[PDB]
């Protein structure tokens, strides 16, 4: 079947009726299956709309509105799946049009209801018995209203059952694994499959890429497994499409996900934290002649993770500047910068909200690359702020440029840091001048935590350490991991407390896991299938030769097999 993309422009009219139609034709010319929604709109009168006859199937919704053309020959449209809805919960919508809508082959609507209103020239359609088409679940939302001038039309041939027909002529008058009638009882006798399809055979789901192997308790990849490209199953996704995280092919990757490439097939892995977004710094491109982050441009930094260029925060931002017509920046909006991890240029901070204590907004900043430097000198400059600690706890590298920190009368710590450990370029130097005296900081316990190493701290809390005295639970330094005790039970990997698998029972006066997996803990907390402390036995998971493998419980909570007879589980 020939495939086109579909449309979701709704009631919009793209330019001239000619330009609109010309692009409508371009989309659906010679098209058999519509992957998206079908939208026929603003079609002029006496327009050759006979090309619509090719369309056999629609995945999304069908919208026909604002048309004055006499005929709309959807003569071979067999099925509307209704994977998306136009408005409310309609799969088919015919609104404010049109004389002839001969949908003689429309046998099944898999999901959604139907709407007819304001079609003063429509004929015959009001006689169709929708109960044979729409699933009884969608009946409750049906909205059928046919009304015309007087409604003078042609009459259904007597051949028709109960006088129900789409138009003139006698030509206008199964079950499992199917949804478009049948030419007999089988998988193959279907003009349109139900759930999915693969080489004439209909199915409930495409053969899963991976299958459970009771002969090993491990997961093995079924070579007789295909993806799912819309309603069909494909051995390999078509061109430019990409594999989701549940087997299907799709055009481009999700918003909370990104594209990788295992072997040759391009796949979609979920983003580890906020997906990467590179944005332009100050004094470049979108902001070539901008002086700093102001009230105007700050919003363009939303969702940014990387910055190509520099980042300026000057007094003018908080004052506002009339000459450029830009208000005084609201300091709260600086939180937008919380998602930035990388700065390729330099970071300059000559201003900062007085009521804030540290450079909170950069608590996640990891690297300053200093490819560009202030006065060709500074990669990081923090000057004359009121802040008490810097708070760059995620900062792990300043690869080039000099670091200048001065005039912050209240700034403690800072000198506690070994900046060499961050530097990567030779000759990088640090000027830490005219801040809060060390002895003054001692006087008020403004001192690195006992749980910090001697490498210093970005602040007073234990999460502010450079490195940890003993070990680290996430971002925090701690005395010891939850070995034996503790609510979340843990094991140590590289001086770093790691959480035991959830489905592992704690233990009295003894450890409760050895590794990150379920096959690495003494006693299960729920069930047990082989080495794997599972939370619930596998009951229904497919395996080799397509056989639903079931498993039962036990008094000892061990997952035992069920007799091959049981097809629903013991």
């Amino acid at each position: 079947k020939k495939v086109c993309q579909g449309t979701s422009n709704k009631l919009t009219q793209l330019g001239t009726f000619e330009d609109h139609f010309l692009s409508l034709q371009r989309m659906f010319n010679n098209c058999e299956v519509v992957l998206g929604n079908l939208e026929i709109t603003y079609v002029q009168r006496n327009y050759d709309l006979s090309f619509l006859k090719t369309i056999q199937e629609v995945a999304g919704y069908v919208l026909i509105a604002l048309n004055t053309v006499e005929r709309i020959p959807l003569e071979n449209l067999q099925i509307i799946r209704g994977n998306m809805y136009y408005e409310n919960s309609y799969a088919l919508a015919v609104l404010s049009n049109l004389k002839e809508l001969p949908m003689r082959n429309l046998q099944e609507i898999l999901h959604g209801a139907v709407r007819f209103s304001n079609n003063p020239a429509l004929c015959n359609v009001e006689s169709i018995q929708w109960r044979d088409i729409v699933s009884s679940d969608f009946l409750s939302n049906m909205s059928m209203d046919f009304q015309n001038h007087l409604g003078s039309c042609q009459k259904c041939d007597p051949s028709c059952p109960n006088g129900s027909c789409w138009g003139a002529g006698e030509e206008n008058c199964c079950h499992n694994q199917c949804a478009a009638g049948c030419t007999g009882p089988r998988e193959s006798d279907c003009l349109v499959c139900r759930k999915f399809r693969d080489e004439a055979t209909c199915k409930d789901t495409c053969p899963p890429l991976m299958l459970y192997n009771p002969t090993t308790y491990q997961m093995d990849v079924n070579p007789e497994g295909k993806y799912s490209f819309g309603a069909t199953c494909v051995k390999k996704c078509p061109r430019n499409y990409v594999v989701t995280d549940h087997g299907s092919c799709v055009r481009a990757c999700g918003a909370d996900s990104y594209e990788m490439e295992e072997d040759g097939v391009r796949k979609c892995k979920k983003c580890e934290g906020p997906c990467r977004k590179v944005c332009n710094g100050i004094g470049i491109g979108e902001f070539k002649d901008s002086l700093s982050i102001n009230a105007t441009n700050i919003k363009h930094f939303k969702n940014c993770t990387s910055i190509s260029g520099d980042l300026h925060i000057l007094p003018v931002a908080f004052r506002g500047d009339s000459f450029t017509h830009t208000p005084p920046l609201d300091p709260q909006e600086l939180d937008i910068l919380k998602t930035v991890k990388e700065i390729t240029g330099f970071l300059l901070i000559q201003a900062w909200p007085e009521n804030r204590t540290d450079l909170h907004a950069f608590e996640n900043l990891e690297i300053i690359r200093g490819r560009t430097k202030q006065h060709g000198q500074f990669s990081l400059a923090v000057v004359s702020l009121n802040i008490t600690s810097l708070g760059l706890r995620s900062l792990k590298e300043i690869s080039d440029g000099d670091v200048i920190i001065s005039g912050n009368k209240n700034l403690c710590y800072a000198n506690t840091i070994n900046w060499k450990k961050l530097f990567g370029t030779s000759g990088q130097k640090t000027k830490i001048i005219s801040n809060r005296g060390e002895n003054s900081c001692k006087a008020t316990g403004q001192v690195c935590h006992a749980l910090c190493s001697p490498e210093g701290c970005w602040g007073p809390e234990p999460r502010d350490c450079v490195s940890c005295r003993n070990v680290s639970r996430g971002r925090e330094c701690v005395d010891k991991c939850n070995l034996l005790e503790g609510e979340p039970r843990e094991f140590v990997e590289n001086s770093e407390c790691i959480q035991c698998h959830p489905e592992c029972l704690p233990q009295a006066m003894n450890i409760t896991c050895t590794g990150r997996g379920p096959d690495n803990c003494i006693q299960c907390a729920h069930y047990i299938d082989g080495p794997h402390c599972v939370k619930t036995c596998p009951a229904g998971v497919m395996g080799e030769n397509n056989t639903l493998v079931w498993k039962y419980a036990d008094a000892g909570h061990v997952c035992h097999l069920c007799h091959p007879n049981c097809t629903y589980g013991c």
Partner: antibody
Amino acid sequence: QVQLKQSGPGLVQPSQSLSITCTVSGFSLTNYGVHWVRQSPGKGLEWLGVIWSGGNTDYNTPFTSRLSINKDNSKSQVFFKMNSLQSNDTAIYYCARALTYYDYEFAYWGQGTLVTVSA
Amino acid sequence: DILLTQSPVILSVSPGERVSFSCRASQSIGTNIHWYQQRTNGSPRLLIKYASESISGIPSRFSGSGSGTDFTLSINSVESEDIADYYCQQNNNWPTTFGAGTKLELKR
């Protein structure tokens, strides 16, 4: 040549205010801050405050509530202004610029303004 | 706060002699120290920055050393014109502060 030149009367009556104008040449007030120092014949050299390139200002705590530094980048000048003076404020008042950015090694000084406090 | 003790208060010296000015800081401040010369009816003159870095235009005979708390301004062989007050300046704790100075008198 980097030059700071000062102008302002030095005689101030008690309870009144002192005003000095550091006219700058050789650098921009956009790139360097201009510091204000005084030198008592008895309490030695005292840093009073700064007006940074950004227009933000920092004052030494004994002067926060009675000191005002503003500037005009275009006219290339800085305006110092300390209110309600007293006998102990008798001193030479300097303006200075640091050799390097953001720093405090003062390589360039104004000529000084001898301030006499008396009725 | 931090105190900069300069010694001696006065320092009478014949030309050719060696001269060392002391500036001791109550707290250890690495090498965040600066040195100044102030000549009669003159505005102070930066001699040394960060304890040892030489400022252009200054005679080579001037030099600086020391760190932590004990700092020393030195002169190879004093010359008549070296008559001045000499100040040290800390750069570590807010705000910058200066020492009470040491006066260099000359014998002839």
